[PDB]
Design a protein around this ligand. Structure first.
Ligand code: GTP
Ligand code: GTP
Ligand code: GTP
Ligand code: SAM
Ligand code: SAM
Ligand code: SAM
Ligand code: MG
Lengths: 288, 1057, 378, 76, 50
């Protein structure tokens, strides 16, 4: 509660300034996704140290991404569409070739060490029994073992699937920069001078058949009840390298379709583009 | 000193170890040492730990395994206090053992070790292709040529680049890095040109003018703001470095242009690159605030974007339009050429323009950091003002400026117990003089004394005036810091008066340490406590002057006749605890225990006697003069009868009262009474109340009656005032050249752009003006400036309104003060006694001068820096004849003041007194022009010459100030003279050499012999109240004790024709 | 280049920081009330110091570690001019505290740290006014232009002017400004110690002519230069003081302090930047001033010593470790050794002696060594 | 926590300091030199956590707390 | 409000109550289990109250 007071007095949000300095709200407002496109960011992820809110900022250090910022090399060479002036998907985890120990998993180890500490101090403030506390620690380390065990097949297999899907033709946008503190998607719109702009990214709230809601719960099955072709190795499933042709043809079909989707509208508007007008008086400065 | 003199060198390459040292670069055997291996620090305000590894390790990526080490858990382990050095050394040492860089050591002396790649490959745990290349061929990390260090890894990997994460300099913060550096495979300059030109096609990248290891590297920022902070840090670096090169001193600079070049960036970065390239005078002047550096640079780029200077504006704009080009001064370019000469194949940024720097003549004043600027405004300057608009000062909070009514007095503890004497002059008391003095006394008493005198006497109480000193002594005694003092010393008395507890020395000059857990309360003192103490010290000083010990003799007693609580009786009883047999008792009609409660005169039955008596009797009841008279007479009568050394108070010391007392002591049978008027430093500064000192002496006393005595005149000159007392105003509107301000002070705040203007306008009234911004981010400047009447009497002599405004605009914005602390100005500031006497002189002479008709000019000979200007009316011409005076022909011409700037010639033949002139000789007659004192006969001679020289003139008036002889007789016997002295019998005011004094009788006799009209006048009490009111000054204690005897004995001769 | 490379502040830095470092540990104890060591102590630490008795400073209050006193480049110099003023009032003195009821002014002022260190040095003395008074002055120091305003009253028993306009200016203005500065400095005090930025014979003599022009007061005068000044500054402190006698031989001519300035003039050649040589040619005579520095295989070490002998007069060397074959070598170039060795073309050396050294015989040191491009000399 | 003896100065300073960090009054800083800050309304609105109508007015228009004329501070 | 002032007042109240019931619990030498359970009910009350 104390560090919470010290943190929240600063504000629950902030805006990066034109000078680049952070400017915290000073207010304890509940966040809404409508703000995601606003200038504001959540304050927890500012990664700005505060004088007496240190444990908060520390626990917030646990949320830092463990990936890297790959250039979209092949998508560039294939001359695929890209909204960014330099395309760059952020792959969540590095390939860990040759290591005795998995760096992702060791990061999860330090994270659960700090978590064990936090849950511990809460456990002693709550005067709760030694048994339940040791059990919470037992689950924490069990999580750590499950994570080492699974991550060996995460960083080294899924990452090349992100690295490959990063190159697909229709993945034109940049997705992250790795900096939670400052990243915000570039917000293009189709401005019409004789109309109102349509933002591309909008909280239109249409769910696209439920696609825009996110269960975080899904991480539990990932850590626990799911298996990977690499994790199984003691049977050795051969890895699958899917034919490019399916997603390539699907992308081509989408592209080719919307490429000609707009043509009559575009042509007509091309014709009338000069047709907008302003009423104007013409005063006569001299005789005849 | 135009050419830059610098040894450029690749410091980053120099930091890379020989391969053999890599085995022991951790120094595994020995512990890391502070300041050599690391630099830990703890900012307790920010509560932030900061560990900074030194040497090669300053550049170090950390594997997530490295972060799992306990050493990085420490800052979380110690939220509040600094990490103990033992834990820091132990943990940092164990982690230092934990690290081991891959390498293959080899004999070649030309080899280095690619430390960047080594630590990086380590931190990834060798999973990146660079990591595999290193883990399989560690020898690849060795390199002779610095560039091929990377070309080997590029050719070996087939990549066009690698992208290294940057280190955070503090190793404790784990926050995500703003940018990463990308090392490119570009061995030739042409490959670099291509990579740069391609780089301008892509967002958020920038690069250095030249690169380390001679291998091209580009920063890629994760966000715009991160780029902005980076660029700003680099602009600071290049600005400082260029600041050192401009001074011409040799510098070990890493590269000639330390700042970055955007390749692609937002508008705000392009602005940063432009002002950064400009090397604006504003950095050298410290005009920008560096607390929010990038913001300052943005605003600065704004001012340059529409600069008044066309050159600077067009240059900034050009720099903004082509930000990819690296603008640089020609002196930089010659350095770059020298570098290309020394290393022919070096890579450095190809796109560059060589602009000529534009000179600017405006030297802004600046000083960032705490401290208010204490301006001294000039009366006039180059700027010509015309009908300036009124400048409102804003309201200011008590968070910033408090206004205490009186300045507490800073003073040595001994000085409090000083006192001054005034012995009687008259040999007789004729009955007509009795009727006259009684008439003046009754008429004065019947209508109460001046309301302004009462306002001052009650505003400036001595108790609150001495309070900080006493509470300080108590505060040091409580901490045990106090130690040595003599048994009889005044410091011992102040200690007895500071604390309620008994003090006992363990031996000579050594007080007992406080018993543990015991913190005795400060001794309780009413307003008359310190005064009674000082009268006691005065009694001890009067029994013999030689004494340093103030303890009473054994088997002797004292009485404090006025009593309530009478704290002084307690402090005295406590002061003399080690002395055997010392009775000490209060004895008032209002007396509480210990003090006996009894009326005065004493009951016929009761037996009272003592070797000392300190009466302080003062009836609270309003009463008829006959009753006050008979009561005071009976009080002094019993006080004299009951003791050999009474020290009676007199509330209404009219000449009639004191002389009646002497007549009464004369009436008592068989005992002649020596007597003297007296006033302690511990008395209230403005009280006219006086302590008459009675003592028998075997001889009859020649000259026993008083007449025109100092202590008496301090009272009788005061009378009902024609005008209401002047309450000090606090002005907030600064009108241009108004002359409508009442005494008091301007105080408030203004926007800093308006600050130079307000100083140019308050100069008319205020003589000096303190100012300060409160913070770097707060635009307002607070301003306090008290109104000097002398500055008014100077500035309003003529209607011209010139000032040094052009100088004051140099100040904005950092050049006029900074202080976070609240400041506490006083409505009544402290002043030395000599200054106040001078102001009383000026009030007397000014009121005397306004009365005179048809006078063409005032000639103040010996006028120094126009000090007598307060006296002279704004109409008549002023003339100074002091050689010491500085010449200012512009100020003289603009303010109607001729200045002779030559010594005055006192010889009568050389004399040149004009008709209708007022000649001021205020304290100038007593000194030679070089400052050595003239002998008194020479003084009386030159007075005689100024007297005879005026004998011819039809209309003239001289005011010759001089010191009367009697004062030396009084200061030989007094104690309260911290400033005035008597070295070998001569007066020694302030810092002047001692000077012999004239006798008033011989001077008046001489003026009678001259036949000239004359009058020996001195400033009165109302003149003192006038000085203190108009100037915003409070008198203080020692000043209030010595002012009567000093001012009464500095007569002003008033010659007239 | 020299005057700015070798600033006095960084030159005296280790000594001052050493005094602060000993005071912080409580190791310092005895010193006289008026001693120069007392002044250095006042200049080392921000806190007020108070002796508990003669020659015994108060122990630090527990948990209190006051920050080092802040000093700009002209701090120590102003201190030394103060000590010079005390030494000039009488030469016998060991105490440097001001007399009670006396005052001093430091006419050049910004922060003016010396005013603070002086105020702190004289804390036990009663009645000692000490104030800076520049046009750029910050509090405590009063901010005011020189010449002083006709209204303002300024006087002192001592004055340490340090006035130096930052603005580039015509010679007539620099001349009149310096003249008015010395004029007010002499008029306002019995013992001025004025700075002169451009002490040409004409400037100093004009100053003496100006003091000669003032009525009734003959002025004894002397040029002066403190140890606390920057080593290469030609700037000089003229010392004014009235004396009852007229001064025989008052004007300067070919004086030392002046010649230190006037002999310097625009240089025909660019300043010689110290090179750091890595190639030791045999008997070349092509090396610019500076020093050889680097490393060689230890078998090659006797050879290199036989070759650097031609230029270097003495050469430090060391292997860094027993297991590290290279020997590091530093050897600065002595012009006297060049003027000797290159008189004739013979190239003899004691190489046979140097090969006796390898491998353990030519140095060992794990510690990093810090050679200077500009070594100290008497 | 301390029924009997005085609260130790270290705990008092530390806790009072942390609570001092905890407080942050709403305001809009501005260049005008004539302005003040309606501290009464500011702290009051804060203490109610901005639930009173005065609290809403302050939380939505903090600049309303600034005032030149002292009376109009409330009339607004 | 992000947080309800009534409920936060109930929070401080149950904090003080937890302290009182605690000191009685330690004077009564009663087991750690029952004590932690009383605290669990107190905070559960606090949640229900918010
Ligand atoms: N990871 C890593 N980064 C390095 C190393 N050496 C230099 N860098 C980075 O390279 C970037 C540019 O290199 P430099 O020119 O040598 O450094 P700089 O730009 O002058 O700025 P500073 O590093 O702060 O001194 C810097 O931001 C450094 O963080 C290294 O050995 N390892
Ligand atoms: N180079 C440069 N151009 C500027 C600057 N300020 C405005 N401009 C020009 O003005 C255009 C936009 O003007 P504004 O919107 O008023 O600028 P701003 O972002 O509001 O910044 P401010 O002028 O400080 O209010 C930009 O495209 C610039 O070309 C500046 O400080 N530097
Ligand atoms: N909540 C709150 N109350 C205030 C504030 N300022 C003044 N008051 C209250 O206003 C009442 C009357 O105001 P004042 O006239 O300034 O105070 P007072 O009547 O002279 O008496 P004191 O407040 O004890 O000095 C007092 O009882 C104060 O408690 C404020 O800033 N916040
Ligand atoms: C100005 S007070 C100061 C008393 C004492 N100096 C103290 O420590 O407070 C003088 C006191 O003397 C008392 N007093 C007045 N008339 C008296 C009298 N006729 N005889 C004895 N005491 C008297 C009054 O009650 C008055 O309070
Ligand atoms: C007491 S001071 C100034 C008088 C007055 N208190 C004031 O401030 O205007 C007297 C000054 O007069 C100057 N002086 C001394 N003898 C003089 C003389 N014979 N003629 C003119 N000025 C003289 C001295 O330089 C000295 O500084
Ligand atoms: C070389 S600096 C040293 C100042 C001082 N010794 C200190 O402690 O920093 C001299 C200063 O005198 C100031 N100054 C220049 N001309 C002046 C003048 N005519 N009158 C008074 N002060 C001046 C300048 O602002 C300059 O900063
Ligand atoms: Mg650098």
């Amino acid at each position: 509660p104390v560090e919470y007071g010290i943190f929240v007095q600063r504000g629950a949000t902030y805006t990066i300034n034109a000078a680049g300095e952070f400017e915290f709200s000073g207010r304890n407002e509940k966040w809404d996704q409508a703000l995601y496109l606003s200038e504001h960011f959540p304050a927890l992820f500012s990664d700005v140290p505060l004088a007496g809110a240190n444990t908060i900022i520390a626990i917030m250090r646990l949320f830092t991404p463990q990936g890297f910022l790959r250039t979209d090399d092949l998508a560039i060479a294939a001359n695929f569409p890209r909204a960014s002036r330099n395309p760059q998907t952020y792959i969540p985890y590095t390939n860990q070739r040759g290591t005795v120990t998995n760096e992702f998993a060791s990061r999860f180890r330090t994270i659960v060490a700090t978590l064990a500490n936090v849950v511990n101090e809460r456990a002693v403030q709550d005067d709760m029994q030694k048994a339940t506390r040791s059990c919470t620690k037992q689950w924490l380390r069990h999580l750590e073992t499950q994570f080492d065990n699974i991550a060996v097949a995460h960083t080294d297999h899924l990452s090349v699937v992100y690295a490959t899907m990063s190159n697909f033709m229709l993945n034109f946008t940049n997705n992250f920069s790795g900096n939670h503190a400052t990243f915000k998607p570039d917000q293009y719109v189709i401005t019409s001078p004789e109309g109102s702009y349509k933002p591309i990214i909008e909280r239109q709230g249409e769910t696209v058949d439920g696609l825009t809601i996110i269960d975080t719960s899904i991480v539990w099955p990932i850590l626990c009840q799911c298996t990977y072709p690499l994790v199984r190795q003691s049977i050795m499933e051969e890895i699958v390298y899917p034919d490019p042709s399916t997603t390539l043809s699907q992308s081509l079909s989408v592209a080719q379709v919307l490429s000609k989707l707009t043509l009559p509208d575009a042509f007509i508007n091309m014709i009338l583009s000069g047709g907008d007008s302003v009423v104007m008086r013409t005063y006569q400065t001299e005789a005849d | 000193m135009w050419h830059y003199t610098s040894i450029n060198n690749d410091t980053r390459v120099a930091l890379d170890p020989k391969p053999n040292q890599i085995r022991t670069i951790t120094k595994p055997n020995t512990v890391p040492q502070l300041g050599t291996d690391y630099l830990y620090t703890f900012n307790s305000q920010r509560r932030s730990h900061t560990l900074r590894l030194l040497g090669p390790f300053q550049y170090f990526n950390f594997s997530e395994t490295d972060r799992g080490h306990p050493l990085f858990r420490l800052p979380l382990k110690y939220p509040s206090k600094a990490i103990p050095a033992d834990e820091l050394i132990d943990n940092l040492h164990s982690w230092m053992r934990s690290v081991h860089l891959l390498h293959v050591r080899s004999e070649d002396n030309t080899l280095r070790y690619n430390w960047m790649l080594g630590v990086y490959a380590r931190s990834t745990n060798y999973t990146t292709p660079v990591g595999q290349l290193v883990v399989n061929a560690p020898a690849i990390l060795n390199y002779s040529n610095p560039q091929d260090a990377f070309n080997s890894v590029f050719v070996a990997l087939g990549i066009d680049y690698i992208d290294i994460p940057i280190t955070n300099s503090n190793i404790f913060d784990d926050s995500s890095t703003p940018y990463n550096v990308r090392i490119w495979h570009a061995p030739t300059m042409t490959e670099v040109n291509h990579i740069l030109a391609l780089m301008r096609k892509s967002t958020l990248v920038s690069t250095h003018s030249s690169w380390h290891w001679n291998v091209l590297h580009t920063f890629h920022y994760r966000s715009e703001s991160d780029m902005i902070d980076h660029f700003a840090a680099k602009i600071l670096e290049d600005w400082r470095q260029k600041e050192k090169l401009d001074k011409g001193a040799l510098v070990e600079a890493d590269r000639v242009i330390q700042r970055l070049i955007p390749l692609s960036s937002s508008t705000y970065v392009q602005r940063l690159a432009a002002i950064g390239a400009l090397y604006p005078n504003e950095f050298t002047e410290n005009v920008l605030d560096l607390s929010r550096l990038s913001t300052a640079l943005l605003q600065l780029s704004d001012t340059y974007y529409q600069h008044a200077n066309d050159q600077l504006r067009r240059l900034y704009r050009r720099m903004y339009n082509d930000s990819r080009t690296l603008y640089m001064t020609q002196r930089h370019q010659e350095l770059l050429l020298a570098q290309i000469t020394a290393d022919p194949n070096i890579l450095l940024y190809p796109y560059t323009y060589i602009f000529t720097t534009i000179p600017t003549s405006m030297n802004y004043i600046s000083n960032t950091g705490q401290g208010r600027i204490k301006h001294s405004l000039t009366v006039t300057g180059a700027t010509e003002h015309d009908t300036v608009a009124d400048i409102v000062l804003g309201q200011t909070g008590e968070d910033v400026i408090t206004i205490s009514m009186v300045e507490p007095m800073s003073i040595a503890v001994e000085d409090m117990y000083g006192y001054v004497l005034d012995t009687p002059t008259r040999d007789i008391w004729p009955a007509d003089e009795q009727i006259e003095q009684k008439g003046d006394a009754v008429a004065l008493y019947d209508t109460k004394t001046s309301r302004a005198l009462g306002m001052f006497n009650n505003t400036v109480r001595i108790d609150d005036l001495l309070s900080p000193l006493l509470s300080l002594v108590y505060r040091t005694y409580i901490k045990g810091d106090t130690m040595t003092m003599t048994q009889g010393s005044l410091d011992h008395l102040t200690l007895c008066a500071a604390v309620d507890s008994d003090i006992t020395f363990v031996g000579n000059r050594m007080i007992a340490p406080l018993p543990e857990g015991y913190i005795p309360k400060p001794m309780h003192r009413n307003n008359s406590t310190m005064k009674m103490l000082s009268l006691y010290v005065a009694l001890k000083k009067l029994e013999n002057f030689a004494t340093n010990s103030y303890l009473m003799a054994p088997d002797t007693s004292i009485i404090l006749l006025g009593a309530e609580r009478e704290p002084a009786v307690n402090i005295l009883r406590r002061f003399n605890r080690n002395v055997s047999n010392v009775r000490i008792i209060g004895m008032g009609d209002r007396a509480v225990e210990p003090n006996i409660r009894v009326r005065v005169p004493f009951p016929i039955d009761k037996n009272i006697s003592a070797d000392f008596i300190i009466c302080d009797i003062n009836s609270y009841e309003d009463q008829s003069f006959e009753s006050m008279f008979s009561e005071t007479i009976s009080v002094v009568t019993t006080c004299a009868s009951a003791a050999t050394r009474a020290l009676v108070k007199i509330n209404h010391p009219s000449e009639y009262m004191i002389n009646s007392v002497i007549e009464r002591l004369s009436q008592l049978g068989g005992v002649f009474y020596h007597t003297a008027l007296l006033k302690t430093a511990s008395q209230n500064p403005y009280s006219y109340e006086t302590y008459i000192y009675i003592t028998p002496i075997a001889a009859a006393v020649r000259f026993p009656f008083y007449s025109n005595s100092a202590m008496i005149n301090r009272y009788m000159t005061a009378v009902a005032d024609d005008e209401m007392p002047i309450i000090p105003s606090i002005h907030t509107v600064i009108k241009g050249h108004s002359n409508t301000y009442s005494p008091g002070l301007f105080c408030g705040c203004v926007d800093v752009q308006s600050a130079p203007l307000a100083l140019s306008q308050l100069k008319s009234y205020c003589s000096e003006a303190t100012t300060w911004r409160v913070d770097s981010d707060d635009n307002l400047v607070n301003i306090i400036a008290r109104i000097d009447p002398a500055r008014i009497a100077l500035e309003f002599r003529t209607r011209s309104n010139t000032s040094a405004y052009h100088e004051y605009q140099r100040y904005v914005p950092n050049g006029l003060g900074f202080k976070v602390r609240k400041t506490r100005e006083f409505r009544y500031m402290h002043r030395e006694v000599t200054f106040i006497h001078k102001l009383m002189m000026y009030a007397l002479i000014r009121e005397q001068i306004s009365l005179t008709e048809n006078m063409t000019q005032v000639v103040s000979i010996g006028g120094r820096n126009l000090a007598d200007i307060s006296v002279v009316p704004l109409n008549m011409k002023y003339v100074v004849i002091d050689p010491a005076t500085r010449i200012e022909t512009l100020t003289q011409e603009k303010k109607n003041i001729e200045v002779q700037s030559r010594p005055f010639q006192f010889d009568a033949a050389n004399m040149d007194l004009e008709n209708n002139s007022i000649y001021l000789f205020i304290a100038v007659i007593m000194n030679e022009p070089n400052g050595a004192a003239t002998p008194a006969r020479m003084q009386m001679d030159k007075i005689r010459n100024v007297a005879t020289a005026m004998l011819t003139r039809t209309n003239c008036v001289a005011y010759i100030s001089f010191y009367e002889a009697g004062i030396i007789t009084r200061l030989d016997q007094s104690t309260a003279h911290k400033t005035i002295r008597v070295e070998e019998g001569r007066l020694k005011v302030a810092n002047y050499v001692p000077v012999d004094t004239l006798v008033e009788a011989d001077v008046t006799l001489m003026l009678r012999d001259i036949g000239i009209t004359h009058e020996i006048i001195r400033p009165s009490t109302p003149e003192l109240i006038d000085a203190c009111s108009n100037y915003g000054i409070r008198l203080g204690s020692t000043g209030g004790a010595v002012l009567d005897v000093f001012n009464h004995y500095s007569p002003v001769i008033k010659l007239v024709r």
